[model samples]
Target chain A: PLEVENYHALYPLEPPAQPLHAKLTFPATTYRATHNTTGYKYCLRRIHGFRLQSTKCMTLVEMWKKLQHTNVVQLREVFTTKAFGDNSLVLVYDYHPGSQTLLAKYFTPAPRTSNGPLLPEATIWSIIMQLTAGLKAIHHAGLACKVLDPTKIIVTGKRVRFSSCCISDITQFDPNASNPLALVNMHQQDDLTALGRLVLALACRCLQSVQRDNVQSSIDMVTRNYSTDLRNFIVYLFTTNNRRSVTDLMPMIGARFYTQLDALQSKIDMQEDELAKEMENGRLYRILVKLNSINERPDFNLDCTWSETGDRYMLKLFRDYLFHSVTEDGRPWLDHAHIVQCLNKLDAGSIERVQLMSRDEQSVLIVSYAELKNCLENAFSELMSS
Target chain B: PLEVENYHALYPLEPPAQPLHAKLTFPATTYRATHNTTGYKYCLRRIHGFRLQSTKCMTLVEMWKKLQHTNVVQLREVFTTKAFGDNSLVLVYDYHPGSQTLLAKYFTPTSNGPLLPEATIWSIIMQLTAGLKAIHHAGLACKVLDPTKIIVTGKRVRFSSCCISDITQFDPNASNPLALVNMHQQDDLTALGRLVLALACRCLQSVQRDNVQSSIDMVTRNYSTDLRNFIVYLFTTNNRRSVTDLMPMIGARFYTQLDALQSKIDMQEDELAKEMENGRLYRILVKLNSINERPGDRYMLKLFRDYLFHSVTEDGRPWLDHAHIVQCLNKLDAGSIERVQLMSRDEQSVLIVSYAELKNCLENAFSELMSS
Candidate 1:
């Protein structure tokens, strides 16, 4: 999640953990921030050494903005501000919280060993399917993913998508840089081949999975365990001379696309149940904290005060009455359902009365749960208002 | 989940379970039932076709009974009964409550064209291969590898009819029991290829030899070259097939599933950890409720409760923000020495107290309750 581009555009917040957490960044100075109009948080990415060679480059930003897809992180806005007293191109995009770079997710492992584990065939296809869909949209829209870099790929859980897409176009855009129609098609061609190399690196589970000279050695590694078809696809992408379309590449992927979707749905169903159980935990704990803190104070407006005679004394009996019940046979009754019943009425301040008695079993006091609840509430108020 | 007879409650999972719904022959109806003793819900597969033989072929059950894997649904019990006024065989399997069939999940007519991500294909294939491995090793066959019959439950692909298949198709007097399982296991691998092919094309009808070239063309065009060869390898390897032979291919691609599984587990584990922490307060609060016995000291505690919850703002209105209670309780639980001015309702007395002293009082009271 990138944030402030020109730390000056965004006011500096009091650094809590590290005073200059954002200072420990490069490749594009960035930070996360909330802008007023949208009220939604955004990432501010700075492209250094960038000069607006042409206003047309900003137009490219407009082009990128219009081409939002699920496979691509949306470009919200762009600015060319001189944050460091020199023109720096800053890009603003929708922030995906808890997003990690593809490099951080796959390449950086805990003491990765060659025999430790490799990316599963399913995971390999998982990554390939996303980029294929993304690149297809790009080429179809008369654009290309020129920077198919590791860090530029954002991975959020099981989903992978392309990011920093328009940065290359802006950085390399020349004012008089007009292109032939043939040259325009070449970058689209470059993306498919670049994707192939990216796939090879990921499949091999090494950052430097491919090489300039040892191309045979790399493909051979893919062939050793992977099917010949996987090796063939990369070789074909590298073959390079002809105009190729990713749209044509889908058939080669075949029904494998269904595999990733199944995995995605299965895991999503799992999380749905997981989060449902989680929703009640924090809320219940809050109520418990309030109840637990009350009814047991030693001294509040007097020295070693008689807590039994305080207004909160009824609550002490109420607590015992709520859960500490006994059968006529002297057995403790700890029905969990009873705990909920009593606590809920108190939490909701229900106007339901219950009979509460003293430990001596002599003094009987009748009170509404609402009163008992108010007593608990007023006790905390004194603590805070003080 | 319900039960009846040895089971209890006897509830139906889906409406599709009808006695004479009229599908094919005396067809099977699937649902869930809970065991009366264990109270564990089980998948009840009732095959209403035939009566039990004098020589029970349920020996097939013994094989599948032992073939347990995370990827395969477990076969629990087999009962031959006259529940439907006819001889019916019921296979009880370890129930997965919210499972969907692969056909209903993926091929229910939305995306007509083949558009599966490569991972799902590999995931299904990997699970299917492992299940086949277990059955084949147990000297039996999955005999039911149809996509429609495959159960997709909580990230696992289970063949719903593994134990049932070998039982129904059993020829008790067949001279060579050994020869048939070897051939049928081969049948599972071939069907496995066909199933994947139907899935890729997004049309079960597209799996034919007539348009076979066109189908592979679709597969080759839309899917990866690696996947095409795997599917085709299964197709061509019938004369040269073995799940044992196919192990390396599935083995090589094993990393992603393991990676994704571990990654998913990592997230769920952290969430479980957070849930556990929140439950800590739940236990503390439960103990507050559990503490018993009879307090002028307790009366002061009651006044403190009023001081915390019963409040009036500066302008003389009841103030009931939940945050104040959370804050005060937070300090109390931590035994924070934050002092509060406690007042009697009659305004006759006042007591200055810290949360630490209050906590000390709570600890003593709860311990006393537990003692006697």
Candidate 2:
């Protein structure tokens, strides 16, 4: 029942909604794009040659909307186009300019290059921290970044993020044999295995040499170069069946960064408590808070109808009158004539204070009629907004 | 996630799909269209002058897929078109031939007039009861069942707007929007009762216009005691009796004409049992047992018990249905069906039906067994 406005109407699209604006440092069919109105950059990844299977395209798009994190590339929108000849699925992302693949920027460049220069230990740890945080968030949201290889990892200065998620696994259903996951059997640890390979690539400063040999021996190669702490961490990640969760790896990175995880957990805990309290107290309290916030505006007169009967009596009487007098269609009068007539006839100031208090001991609310009026109006407005 | 194949691909449409085909008698912006593949007729209702509030258009469409009924018009497909300047929602339905609104067929042009004959009223109620049964079975409440929403062609009557439900009630973000909120099963029956009262007006010969007392007086004066009692039975009660419960009482007086109602209920019960015997034994048993009042001599209950254990195979982990067991028996060439015994020496398993002996015992000597 929550009405999300059509994003296309809000941001009017230019001709060629999907276009090849410029070539970027993307792997294959992905391209850089610019918004017509805001001139903001975006990356449009066009997945070609695969028809959608059993899954509804829009339902999967709704799942992607839940993955909101700073260190993950947000799936802004997904649409289908006929221009690709085959049914093409385009994934739009908020673009980061001057970004490169982790493989391109970090690893050694030529043939027969066994290794390249390694970055400072802190820098590698920071990248690991960012990746662990992102992975934890992704897994918490019940999604797996199946394509978590170095090619999908983008690096711009210090900020590291995973650019793809389980959405890319849709391409596995492609009829063609060119898909990356075609031969690779998938599991939850498949992502952990990919992350293990990426950490090894970062440590050894080589991609081609390590991937060419057996993975166990290659992992051994990285274990001998680093200290026991780094070697143990790398080997732990490389272990397929026994790999630990992102939470377990946080302490291995550094305690200072691991504390951020705790802080985040506490913040979420507090929010859960607040939400529970809001639901427990019901919509009336929330409406009151909203009314108080709205009445702070300079143009609004919130205290004009202050009466001695207090907010509880006024709200109760108003709610009963409004709901009882509504038409059979569950709607109030168009011009608020009925509401105005009721308010004019019913004088809160004339009601005995003792009678109002004696009516109910528990639900006695102490506030002015002005606040009650504002709250009711705001409640109606909120209902109308939906 | 069910892949319903694109209906557009199956049936190519003529350009400007909203042409007014002469065969269709829709009241407003509706047209009769033909499927290019089979040349089958279909009605396309194009709704314009509104924008969708959410991208949940497809989600609401899934809810429409649940309502499948014979007397209720089926929704073939739903789509949106940009040809109407704004996005226009199009609903395509399986077409019914020679159908008109009940108001057009039964009511006179002006106010006080003689109504349709008594037989027509009985026919209308019977058709409505059938439609309401199907609608209720689909877990839908038909709150919009006015005279206009009913279509009568010859003897058959169908209810339109089955695709519209409470899901569409979320789209009223406009000022002074009419909202029908929290409708239940009771409201549907109440609406049907009001419709019945409206149709009953047709039977009165001299009900004066703009005079409430005379019309009320005329209804009591014109109709027979039994007919008036039937009208009050539908209108007065709320959740006390289902339409099925009242059918016997109402049809008791007109046995010659109401034989159709009795046969329809019998056919519906057979179909209901056949469809639900496997997965919904509890529901089937409830319905059949409710039909016949008996403790030991109930034939339907005996058949259900026999079907439960005798038909299914127990050699497998999860028991296979009777058809699978029959196919296996056929493959083994174990002919003279009851003579063959299937057993496994290694696992202490019996492959033959265990309940087959129970059936023989119960059928041959029920009185003897009860005495023992």
Number of the top-ranking candidate, with TM-score as the measure:
1
Give each prediction's DockQ, rounded to 2 decimals.
0.12, 0.01
Fill in the DockQ of model 1. 0.12
Model 1, residue B313: distance off in Å is: 9.1
| Every candidate's chain B TM-score | 0.74, 0.53
Fraction of native A-B contacts kept, per candidate: 0.19, 0.00
Ten residues in sequence with the least summed lDDT for candidate 1 chain B: B15-24
Q: After the best TM-score superposition of candidate 1, give how far the Cα of residue B35 lies from its true spot, in angstroms.
A: 7.5
Docking outcome class, model 1 = incorrect
lDDT of 1 by residue, B1-372 (tens): 232346653555564643533234657777677665554567777778666564647666777777766556778877777655656777778787778888877777714755787778888887787667666777888876786668888667888767766676678788888888888888888888888888888877767878766888889888888788878888885385876555445543544554465446556756775565455456555654454233255555566667665666687544566777656656767888788788987778888889888767767766665565
Tell me the lDDT of candidate 2.
0.50
- Looking at model 2, residue A80 earns an lDDT score of 59
